[PDB]
Amino acid sequence: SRFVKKDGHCNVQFINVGEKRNETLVFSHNAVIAMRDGKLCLMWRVGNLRKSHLVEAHVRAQLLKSRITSEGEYIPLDQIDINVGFDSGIDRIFLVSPITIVHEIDEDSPLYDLSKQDIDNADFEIVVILEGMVEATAMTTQCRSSYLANEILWGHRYEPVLFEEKHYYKVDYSRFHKTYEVPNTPLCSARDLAEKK
Amino acid sequence: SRFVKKDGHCNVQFINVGEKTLVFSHNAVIAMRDGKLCLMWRVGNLRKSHLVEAHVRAQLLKSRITSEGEYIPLDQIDINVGFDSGIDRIFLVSPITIVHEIDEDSPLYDLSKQDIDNADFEIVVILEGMVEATAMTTQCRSSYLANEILWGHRYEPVLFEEKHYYKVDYSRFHKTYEVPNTPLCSARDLAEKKYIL
Amino acid sequence: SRFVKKDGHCNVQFINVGENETLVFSHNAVIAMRDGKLCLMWRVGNLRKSHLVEAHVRAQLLKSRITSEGEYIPLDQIDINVGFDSGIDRIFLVSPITIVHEIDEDSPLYDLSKQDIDNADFEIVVILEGMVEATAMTTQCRSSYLANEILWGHRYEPVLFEEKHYYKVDYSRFHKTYEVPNTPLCSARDLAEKK
Amino acid sequence: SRFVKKDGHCNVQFINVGENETLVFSHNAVIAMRDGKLCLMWRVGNLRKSHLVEAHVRAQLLKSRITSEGEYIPLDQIDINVGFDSGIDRIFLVSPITIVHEIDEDSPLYDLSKQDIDNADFEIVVILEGMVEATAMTTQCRSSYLANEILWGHRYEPVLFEEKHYYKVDYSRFHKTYEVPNTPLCSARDLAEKK
Q: Which residue stretches are annotated as topological domain Cytoplasmic (chain A)?
């Protein structure tokens, strides 16, 4: 029943992990946008197929997009930060079971004015990073991945992979990339939801 | 008389260290500290070398339903141990009592003593750092179930001053003593009972 | 089309890289306008074929000063903000990046004008730190820009171009810049009061 | 002239060093006025021949205390702000640096006048951490200052002097200080309320 034991070990068992070809940090194939605790959020999944703990793990993200300044300066692929908790320190994660990374689309978010329709014709790329030190090694690892606009499933949630069994927990990685539609999901941008109230 | 010499060596002797690393108190406590309700736990280094760039984190593990009806097998909720002012970083020599101020932002804000004896959640505690003279970042973990938190308790002092040095009695590390003067209500209740004035 | 593939590999090819040694800083620094704000900028790049993990930047202005109490400080270091407060001092370095310092009210350059720079006497030390992929060794690349090495009214020449399916980085344009005669010759303080 | 060259090497030469050691703290700490604020200062240096990567400092005040609840705390470790909030706790050490703690309303020394420090019995633990250049090890240097090792009305002697082309650091001046009679004898609070 306890996820973590008094000595540090975790009562978790992983099934459907696949060949050792994986056994490393992994990102969900798709990204999603949906309501969470009353706010429109951009979310994606991260998992450690390996068997060791990832020390001082922390996540980052950036929206890549070319732009022109008022000065007329052209910038190839400006890198705009996507807030995933740095300010409060919740960008730092304890990864044992797959975690869902959440980005609140607030007034400061670069996606603040994007609706489902906008995302359809959008032309940007979101780069996601996971970094940390693999247990028993002196090397800090940097796992990367990316989500194009058309790779973001609006109105979807991730299928649970953590199941509570008898005095123990099991993680089913065959559900890692799985998502499901949530019709009730608002279709307007986060900004419209802010004014709507 | 000083705890640290000008050369960096500590004037501390350890006794009753037991038989052969890092370690966490068996229990956690909740008592009044500086006029505020706090959740506390102990962390110590039974080793000889200093811990470099050591820091602590904590998380409340519990399943919940989002306001949108979404079920999360085991949501991870951060428990503030000083990250905002950098005091999550510690200088670990003799056992240290990590303090979580249970204020309006704590997920434990509205938890009374009765709510604890009946609640069902897990508090995961982490301590990371590098053992001196090594290129390895260590991660020590532990956890406290709701019934492992002693409401109205304090830890027994382990550090004592001698003629020209300090002694650390580890046989008292896990020891705690009761304080019947401790309120049985939650932090919120204690806040209202004061703001009325 | 995309810059980073799902497997984490970067869809980029570097040409004219030369024969060389790890990280590199642009020869000159520039001062120009950007989104209604006069900024101090300099380029940083990674020639090495690997990735720079947990990479982040820092800058400092060095200059002797006498304290209001008469104390003399040889080369007092004044921090130059490049994003630490929000965490954008941490970069994902692949294609050469332009580090940006907004010359605001809290900046030590908030009073310098082009004329002031041409007559100024200070040094800006720029730092880039991070870990070379698969190495437990965090490297520190350093450089410096004297007041005269700061090109007032200049912008860097683009080095990233969109090809058919991939992206190419032309390092022969790394240190190159072009003039912006429209750049204000006054200081940031004036531009702020001119409202 | 310049302290740091384009390639990252520093134009500095050290003399009167001895026997090329490691990190070091000034034997004494001082309290003096700096830019209108009463500050607690101490010196830190790198006698090693390599650069210290991602270096930063920390300080704590060790002192037993009684809580309003009557709980006895053998040695509480109250933190001394040396710049964490703005990130200026992160230093670039090539020549001896003076760490500054601004004694403000949030400082545990806010209500301490000279006379007070003469009777005090507390202890300040100072720390310096960083990675030795080219190694994979993070080092930690420690020291401390008792209330009687704090020099009120003092400032450190300069160790960095400008030569014609480079800069020399004279370590024989590391621990030395000189008097500043002008120094207020009242606590930082007194100076604050005296306005």
A: 20-197
